[model samples]
Target chain A: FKTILLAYDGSEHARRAAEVAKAEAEAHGARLIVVHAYEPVPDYLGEPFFEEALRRRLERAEGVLEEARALTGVPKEDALLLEGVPAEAILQAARAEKADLIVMGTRGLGALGSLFLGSQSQRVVAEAPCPVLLV
Target chain B: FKTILLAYDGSEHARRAAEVAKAEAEAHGARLIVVHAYEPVPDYLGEPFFEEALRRRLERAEGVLEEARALTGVPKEDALLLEGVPAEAILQAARAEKADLIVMGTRGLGALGSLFLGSQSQRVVAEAPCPVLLV
Candidate 1:
């Protein structure tokens, strides 16, 4: 793979994905793009409340991306933070960046009841232009 | 990545998956088990024809497993040929082997048009006990 996109959210599964992605990137001498996609939770309270929540979410995303980049030793410029639906943001980034492979973690969020892939991972795998590796 | 189970059938995508599996297995020093699962086609014809078809399918499975083992350089004992539904057989083997990871290819057999992951791959990813790496 020439370019790898890692979908991370600071979970234990994500940490494992990062390790595998780092190794694969190093093995292929490929550029690594670390992405943290955050879907802002709706705040029906007020503008100020929503704004504060957004700020904190952005900060968290940045922190996670930075930590992932540092952990993988990838260049800072390649890391990205996106705002949108989690799976859509990830798919868009992978396509826009033309990633050769997309690496991610599964069983996240406990959204699928009993499915191993979880909702986001399942969506990405169903529609990704390139291959997806679910860790 | 303690143990990686590779589902192989010698297709182009499968070859790519095998390459990734081999790399991951080597990197983690994990045990690699190559499995080729075959489902015999229904034959309303005579017993002789059905038997011949079954034999051919078995031979094909063996050959594919051999090629996968050779490519990955995994031990001969780690290679397996399974007879059943492709997705079910792969899942069963993975569970029986206690594989930490399952690796396979996407876009094979054209079961799902325009989708990267095929039906079998999709099913495996959804229900596998461990993480799945699709190449």
Candidate 2:
């Protein structure tokens, strides 16, 4: 392993995945990039006040990254905030980073959606540029 | 990782998975159990000659396991021939062996089946006792 990507969202499963990612990264003497992906704007699905409320959303994204940083010991700067669909954004990051492996939770906070169980993860594993380890 | 269960079926994707499984096993000082799972019989799906043809099926299973052993350097005896549904038998082996990880191909030879793309893998990942690394 050269570069490992850990997509995090502060979900219970993701926290566990962070541990494995960290162990694998350290064990392999590889680089670890912690990524947090969020959808563009709630306006597309919910909420209003595009200008102000968006700030809160951005802060949450930052918080999630920072939260993962503490768990994985990845520097805050190494953590990236990606704004797009979770699976697509993660895949793009893997390609851009030339990551050899992607470690992530099978279910995230958004997994609570009415019907997102198999959508994001299915897309991720089916189309990942590299191997994906789902926790 | 203490024990990694590598589910192999001699498919091209599974050959890649074997390399990863071998590296992981050696890197972590863990044990590797190469598993080649075959359906009970061709009669269940196609061919006949219940007595004579079944010998061919078992021989093929042995050949697949030996093929994987050559790729992984795993002891021949460590390669098991399982006669059951691929996903279920792999899962049962994981539990019985207390595997910490399951490394496998996203698709097997049987993936060519008209409707088996995600069926087997989906079941293994969703219900796996430990993490699943899909190549």
Candidate 3:
């Protein structure tokens, strides 16, 4: 109950997920931790889009986490942004952060897109370190 | 992974879930625990319809669990008949049995059900003493 992790990718569904996670954290009086996992680079691709995007996406991720803070009424420092495989990063973050609960939104950009493409949210659920709520 | 629990209700989808759980359990040489939860009967005119209905439901449930056993090839000692709430019972037995992982089907039944069921699955994710694999 101390650590509540909310997975955000700035998608509309994820935005709503943040809102719900905010409400839940405030209700439970738990510490909120916001996170975003960058998609991994393909083996065939020489340049890693994730690495390049991480620096740029950091600002946007922070913005969403800020919005989560404002909406959930939590402090700004609680939000976090990380780079790596989305599900793997979530599990790593949960372990590092000692998360008690993991909150996520369903039908994120990936889930709504192609089946093969939008599987991060589902994969995160299957492999998460803690309980995952699909908001 | 010594004990694998599969929650069944005789539905085709549930059978599919059992198949997946069985595959994993057999692969790991784990004992299987097939569970079926009875829905409480409603109170009616002091007739103890609740008890009567529960008895009838348990009969059907046992049949389903047996079917699951036959399908999974789990030993007779491993199948369990359980009463009370579904999600609560699953979690309780999982802890009592020291199950390393829990496998079950998902229909996304609805919100409260999702909480009781989906959320219960999610709850296990967030709160299980061990890992739960949703089939």
Candidate 4:
């Protein structure tokens, strides 16, 4: 595999996903691209005075990517901070990057630690172009 | 990874998953276990003359396992035919076999071939003890 994409949110599971993605990338000598997505503020919710809030949100999104970059050692150029729904952003990146695998995490499953939850992971699993690894 | 478990249902995507699993097994020199699950008929659905239907259904389930066995070169003992819900059966086998990874396929996602659906796969992902690969 040439490329492995990771959808990161800095959640507990996302961190776990980062660890696994890093290992797989090293094992296969594949490039790791870390991506984070944030939803656009609704048009109605936009306010001139709310500019600060939006800027902070964007910054935090960047922080997530930065964290992933640090964990995966993906160069800054490959750390994508995309704007849109989480699932859509990840899918688009996978297609554009020609990723061989997509690694992601869950928020736990119905109070169980072993299972997976988080609709974003489900969306990625459902819509990914390549294989999705739920770690 | 010493043990890899594959959950198959004879779908096109499942065959694709089988292909990947075979390669991964050989790549890592891991033992591959192919599993197929079937739901049991309720007492109301079970009648005296329903023996033929039951026999055929069981046979078909075995056929799916046999197909997976042939694809992956797993021995008959490693090709398991289980009775229960698809997700539960796969999860149990993974746990019992101490699988390092779980591979599966989908019925497709809401008319999208690239995406995945198949509630059984979702359940397995939700409850699996190890990482899940959705192909």
Candidate 5:
């Protein structure tokens, strides 16, 4: 592995995935790119009532990326915050970074919300340019 | 990774998966279990012509497993030859061996045959009890 892209959402499953990614980074002495994606529509709506919610979401995304960097000792430049559909964003990041591996949780915060729906993990595995490890 | 199950069928993709499994097993000091699945319908059909085909299939399955064992340096006892649907057999082997992770080719021997259909890796990831690494 040269570069590893980790898809994270701060869910319990994502936490577990972080551990696996950390292990792989250590094992291969590879670069780690921690990524988190969030929808921007609500924040872009520009309503005063949604301002605080948007701030909190951004803060949460930042906090999650920071924690992942700390956990894997990834450089600050390798941490990414993307705004789009989760799966598409993840795939884009992986491609842009030329990642050889992608590590992610089988499901994240959207698990319960999308219980009957397909998972981002599945999409990543199906379309990723490189190999994917789903925790 | 305590135990890593590798689903193999000796395809080019499967060879890539074996290389990945070897690296992971070495990195984690994990036990490697090699598994290959072959359809046993010919054997069950019970005809003299079918018997020859069945023997050839059995020989081929054993050869594949032996190659996997040699590639990973896993013990012969850890190599399993199963008879059933490939996806189901791989899942059963993973469970029976208490594999913490399943490593497999993204697509295998059936690639050209299933151009319009989904691959076994998709099914394995969807149904595996533990994490799956598609190489």
Candidate 6:
């Protein structure tokens, strides 16, 4: 099979997913790619200012990705930062990476403050090109 | 919150899952709907043996359901037997009945056949209408 992609967002659940993914990768001797998606901030007044804000947001998202990469011990070369909607971007990255399987945390940021974000996981599983195993 | 659906097919794994669903239902006082999917025979074009084969399969599934009902003690009204593709019908029935959660078995009849037929259990886990707890 191809590489396994692990969707990490710096949550405790995501950390757990990394552990599981690391074990799976070791067991199968498959390459691992870690991906963190950067969501576009709400559109502000049109100008170079909006571009600046987006740039800053992407920088912050990169920091998050770097932190996740450090925590998971996945090489920097294998860590991917994509800019788009959360679930959509993650799925696209997985497809682009030609991932055989996706291992991800069960819960992440949500519309409400519920214990889990149902839509994020649901959309990824429903729309992803490959099978997703949520931890 | 509402009823929890448990899909059973008389497998030993399903039997174990019923125990979990029963405990959740009892704790929450939530109604439990036990469902079994029955597939119609493939087009036989009036072959006698084909019809007999299909009939026998249905009869066997019925006995399985009966055994499940006895074991789980789910009310007759709460037990549903649907006819269609297994995953599709299970999702439809869960949505139609407003199920809050779905608890069921993981490896069943499909386990041995998964290498060739693919994994229906994994597909259901991905596309289920509600959260599915696979044993």
Q: Candidate 6 on A5-115: residue-level lDDT in tens?
A: 888877787887787677557645678899988777778648888888888988888988897788668899999988776688788888788987687765776443234
Model 1: per-residue Cα lDDT over B47-75, one tens digit each: 88888887887887788889988898988
- Once superposed on the true structure, which residue ranges of model 5 sit more than 4 Å away at CA? A43-46, A49-53, A70-73, A110-118, B43-46, B110-119
DockQ of each: 0.48, 0.56, 0.04, 0.54, 0.52, 0.05
Candidate 4 TM-score restricted to chain A: 0.88
Better of 2 and 3 by DockQ: 2
Query: Candidate 3 versus the native: TM-score?
Result: 0.51
Q: How many pairs of residues collide in each model?
A: 0, 0, 5, 1, 0, 0
Q: What CAPRI class is candidate 2?
A: medium
Ranking by DockQ: 2, 4, 5, 1, 6, 3
Top candidate when judged by TM-score against the true structure:
2
lDDT of 6 by residue, B1-135 (tens): 368788887778678778867865775578988988877877854779788988898898788888778877998988888877667767888889988777766556632334222255556665764455545
* Model 1 chain A lowest lDDT segment of ten: A107-116
lDDT of 1 by residue, A1-135 (tens): 789999987888889889989977876778999998877758675888888887888888889889898888887888888887678888999989999889988756533524456688878877886778887
Q: What lDDT is reached at residue B34 by model 4?
A: 94
**For residue A51, what is the lDDT in candidate 3?**
67
lDDT string, candidate 2, B35-121, tens digits: 988887655544446766788889999999999999999886778888988888899889988999999988776633322244566
Model 6 CA deviation exceeding 4 Å by range: A45-52, A110-117, B1-135
RMSD of each: 3.8, 3.0, 13.8, 4.5, 3.1, 11.4
Question: Candidate 5's error at B33, in angstroms?
Answer: 1.5
Residue B95, model 4: lDDT of 87
Model 6 root-mean-square deviation = 11.4
Better of 3 and 6 by lDDT: 6
Spell out the clash pairs found in candidate 3: A110-A118, A130-B125, A131-B125, A131-B126, B114-B119
Query: Where is model 2 chain B poorest over a 10-residue stretch in terms of lDDT?
Result: B110-119
